[PDB]
Symmetry: C2
Subunit: 74 residues, 2 copies
Amino acid sequence: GSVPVILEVAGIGKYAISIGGERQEGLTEEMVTQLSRQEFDKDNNTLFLVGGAKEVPYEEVIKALNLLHLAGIK
Amino acid sequence: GSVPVILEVAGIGKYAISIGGERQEGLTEEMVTQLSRQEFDKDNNTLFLVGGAKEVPYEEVIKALNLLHLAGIK
């Protein structure tokens, strides 16, 4: 493959997403869902990975993973 | 940066890790910890991200994230 789908937890409610090499910053939770869902519906074998920064609480990372599960990403 | 630290959940107990462009496959949980800890102690600003495959249960992804937290990765 070229480059997976990457979701980054920049803080509290702010996220960044890397789609096949292209990076998008300043995304919201509702918007991150929209994009994640659209990319997964077009490609079913898209490797999904989630990472958080050192300043983000682990509980928020769980929530992020939770949101992805809710939209059927993982 | 060049390329973050990526940990992939290939299944049940099998993991893959990508360190600055170099990918290692067939790693165990105890070994993944060793590597993750060594990379984090050398670089404190290393972006850490975790992703699981479509065939892996979400509960295992939580466990993986849990293991990283235990060794102070996130």
